[PDB]
């Protein structure tokens, strides 16, 4: 069964927030600037913007 | 033609004093079927001068905590009061109302110049609007207060008050208070 | 009360001394030309400038504005 | 409307002084153990006209009102109206009137004080027994 539009848009909000908090505490040393999440039913992509990518790879 | 409650005419009514002749609205072009207008007459200054005097009465009727927004009932209180007035005296109630407001208005008031605790007042003149304001306020407080805890209803109490006030009877609360305010102005001068 | 700020004043002035020949006395024409003339941030700001431009264009005929 | 010929000014029923002046339905509320609800149903069940003033009731009518007030169960008054529904001792349904209600109350208070139940102790000390805050309020 599927959840409401209201709960769904909230859930995506918490997902974004928690992912950011995790990424900050992990990649702080490699100057993690921000994240961008695009979602497709085939596969959802997460794009990390950081100062020195050579290191975070 | 236009008649108040479709049964009281506004042509046979007559104003006495010229001072209030442009500060009591009830006339040809201010003739309304009901007091209830729901206008913006308290929007800016000197706009309530153009409010029908019957509306000013029924507005100043719904005063104390329990009847603050109970206009629909003050309109029927004024309707019953007007019928009682006509039954008692015989002539147009609007004339009795105008006569009551003409008599009840204090002509010379007292203003506070000095310190708090001590009493020191200068006697001053009263504006025609302020005369109309205090007259209505005093009439309603007299009605209200007189009928608070006794059997006679607000309608016949308001009628009794306006009968007394219109013919300048000492029994009227509004006349007593006017007399006292002018006597205090007379005491100061 | 309502006083025209340095922003609308400065803008209105430079508009006059650039496009004097384009403007006239009518508010709505000045309002419409002010859109084409300047890249302006919002409608209110444009309305206020158009209004004060109208106000200046009145007194320019009366005498030379400083 | 009409002049009363024998207006019984004071009624002496169930060791109580009933004022005939008040209307019968509210007149009998003066009896302890009878409210503005139980009085109504009692009169309706005896099919008396409630409009009548308490002073102008005949001997048989007031005697019927007494006997129907004493034994309600016989006259099809429901179980959920009775003041005493399940009596702690004998476990029967009854309506207790003035002297009976006072006696039953002091007996129930005595019964609670006998066993040393919290409510009994809170009653014996003259405190609240429904678990209100007794700090800020409830003075004297």
């Amino acid at each position: 069964v599927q959840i409401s539009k209201k709960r769904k848009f909230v859930a995506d909000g918490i997902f974004k927030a928690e992912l950011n908090e995790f990424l900050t505490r992990e990649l702080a040393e490699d100057g993690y600037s921000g994240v961008e999440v695009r979602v497709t039913p085939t596969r959802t992509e997460i794009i990390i913007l950081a100062t020195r990518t050579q290191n975070v790879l | 033609d236009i008649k108040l409650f479709g049964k009281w005419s506004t042509d046979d009514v007559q104003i006495n004093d010229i001072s209030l002749q442009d500060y009591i609205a009830v006339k040809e072009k201010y003739a309304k079927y009901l007091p209830h207008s729901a206008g913006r007459y308290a929007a800016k200054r000197f706009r309530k001068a153009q409010c029908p005097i019957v509306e000013r009465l029924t507005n100043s009727m719904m005063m104390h905590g329990r009847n603050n927004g109970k206009k629909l009932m003050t309109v029927r209180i004024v309707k019953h009061a007007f019928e009682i007035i006509h039954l008692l005296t015989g002539e147009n109630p609007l004339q009795v109302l105008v006569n009551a407001i003409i008599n009840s208005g204090p002509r010379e008031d007292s203003t506070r110049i000095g310190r708090a605790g001590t009493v020191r007042r200068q006697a001053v003149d009263v504006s025609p609007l302020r005369r109309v304001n205090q007259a209505i306020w005093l009439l309603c407080t007299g009605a209200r207060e007189a009928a608070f805890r006794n059997i006679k209803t607000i309608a016949e109490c308001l009628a009794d008050e306006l009968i007394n006030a219109a013919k300048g009877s000492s029994n009227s609360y509004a006349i007593k208070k006017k007399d006292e305010l002018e006597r205090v102005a007379k005491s100061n001068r | 009360g309502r006083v025209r700020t340095k922003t609308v004043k400065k803008a209105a002035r430079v508009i006059i001394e650039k496009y004097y020949t384009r403007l006239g006395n009518d508010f709505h024409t000045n309002k419409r030309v002010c859109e084409e003339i300047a890249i302006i941030p919002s409608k209110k700001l444009r309305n206020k400038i158009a209004g004060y431009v109208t106000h200046l264009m009145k007194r320019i005929q009366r005498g030379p504005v400083r | 409307l009409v002049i009363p010929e024998k207006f019984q000014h004071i009624l002496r029923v169930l060791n109580t002084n009933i004022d005939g002046r008040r209307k019968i339905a509210f007149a009998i509320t003066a009896i302890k153990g009878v409210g503005r609800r139980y009085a109504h149903v009692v009169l309706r069940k005896a099919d008396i006209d409630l409009t009548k003033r308490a002073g102008e009731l005949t001997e048989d009518e007031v005697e019927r009102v007494i006997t129907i007030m004493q034994n309600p169960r016989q006259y099809k008054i429901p179980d959920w109206f009775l003041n005493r529904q399940k009596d702690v001792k004998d476990g029967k349904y009854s309506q207790v009137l003035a002297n009976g209600l006072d006696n039953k109350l002091r007996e129930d208070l005595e019964r609670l004080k006998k066993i040393r139940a919290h409510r009994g102790l809170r009653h014996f000390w003259g405190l609240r027994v429904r678990g209100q805050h007794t700090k800020t309020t409830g003075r004297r």
């Binding site: - | 409650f5 479709g6 079927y33 009901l34 209830h36 207008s37 729901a38 206008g39 913006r40 629909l72 309109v75 029927r76 | - | -």
Partner: protein, 139 residues
Amino acid sequence: QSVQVFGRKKTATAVAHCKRGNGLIKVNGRPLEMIEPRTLQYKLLEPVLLLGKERFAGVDIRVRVKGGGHVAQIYAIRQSISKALVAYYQKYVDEASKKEIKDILIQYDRTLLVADPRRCESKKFGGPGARARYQKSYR
């Protein structure tokens, strides 16, 4: 052959449908005289008394009211009726007749044609209402 206009007061809305006929006057399928707040019955009779029944002769209006409260509905319906008539006497009669109606209606009370714009003001934290604040105790 017909026109349809709305009268609005606070959150009350009364839509009057005006067509040709035998001077029929119905609001939510009920006559004006049978409207519940009878104390203000005259407020509904305002537009028909001011103009006169003769103008309503060749006009059937059907009013439907939704939202608001009782007196707000009364002001919505009494506004809607007058706006419907002037709209009909604009579209299917000379402009002179519309002016001859409009001037009388405006001259009596401007509320009959122009809507009272004010609405119930938003409430703020720190008080019970929109302006009033809770009691502030020093010691």
